[PDB]
């Protein structure tokens, strides 16, 4: 049928491997213990995301300072969305951070846990409600990498707008290809892009927690270096007002 590669079929092969937390269950659970593990896992998956971003067709051709800016802005968007997807795919209202670390019903009632997890659980339920397919998911995660740019703009701003539009169309092609009522396609396209818009609020919540945790001196929790500099670099920006959130629907 097709011996030349589609864009979605490439996004499939470059989709990062699912990583392990290295969380020891035998020892009793603890919030501090989970906090520390998720910081570390978060570091390794952002590294995974960099590798992934490079292999996204078009992304390499952007300027390096642009490639860096997009990962600096989008890392939590990607983690939030991939976490929502895996949770939706492995079951109940349970966040599946890794095979060896699931925030089960019991863990959900640990102190402070639900106050943060509710945001990620929202993403999970939305994917369930909408019955998002895998190809739709891959186009949507690709579009989240491209969900923020600096107010002043990128150095390769035009190439960025081309790339983004391509993956908007690629999301369009995903919906049409999905099994079901083709009469619903345009509505579904409205719905799915409305979900991508709603990720800004989710991420804004997650980042404020992450930063507050990072800047708490009485806290004393370990962050991985890669991730720690990204947080150190980004905190000034998110306070000032130098970021422009790309919306699908005003």
């Amino acid at each position: 049928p097709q011996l030349t590669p589609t864009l979605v079929s490439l996004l499939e092969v470059i989709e990062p491997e699912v990583l392990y937390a290295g969380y020891d269950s035998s020892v009793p659970d603890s919030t501090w213990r989970i906090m520390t593990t998720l910081n570390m896992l978060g570091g390794r998956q952002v590294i995974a995301a960099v590798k992934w971003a490079k292999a996204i067709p078009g992304f390499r051709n952007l300027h390096l300072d642009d490639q860096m800016t997009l990962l600096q802005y989008s890392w939590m968007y990607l983690m939030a969305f991939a976490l929502g997807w895996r949770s939706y795919r492995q079951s109940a209202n349970l966040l599946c951070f890794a095979p060896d670390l699931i925030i089960n019903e019991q863990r959900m009632t640990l102190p402070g846990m639900y106050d943060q997890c509710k945001h990620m659980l929202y993403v999970s339920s939305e994917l369930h409600r909408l019955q998002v397919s895998y190809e739709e998911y891959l186009c949507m995660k690709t579009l989240l990498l491209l969900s923020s740019v600096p107010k002043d703009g990128l150095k390769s701003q035009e190439l960025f707008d081309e790339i983004r539009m391509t993956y908007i169309k690629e999301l369009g092609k995903a919906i049409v290809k999905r099994e079901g009522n083709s009469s619903q396609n345009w509505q579904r396209f409205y719905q799915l892009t409305k979900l991508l818009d709603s990720m800004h609020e989710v991420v804004e919540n997650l980042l404020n927690y992450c930063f507050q945790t990072f800047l708490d001196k009485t806290m004393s929790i370990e962050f991985p270096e890669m991730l720690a500099e990204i947080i150190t670099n980004q905190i000034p920006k998110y306070s000032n007002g130098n970021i422009k959130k790309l919306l699908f629907h005003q």
Binding site: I47, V50, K51, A53, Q67, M68, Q72, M226, E229, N233
Partner: peptide, 11 residues
């Protein structure tokens, strides 16, 4: 900048 981020992107 973040030297390691830059490195991973470039090589």
């Amino acid at each position: 900048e973040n030297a390691l981020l830059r490195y991973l992107l470039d090589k």
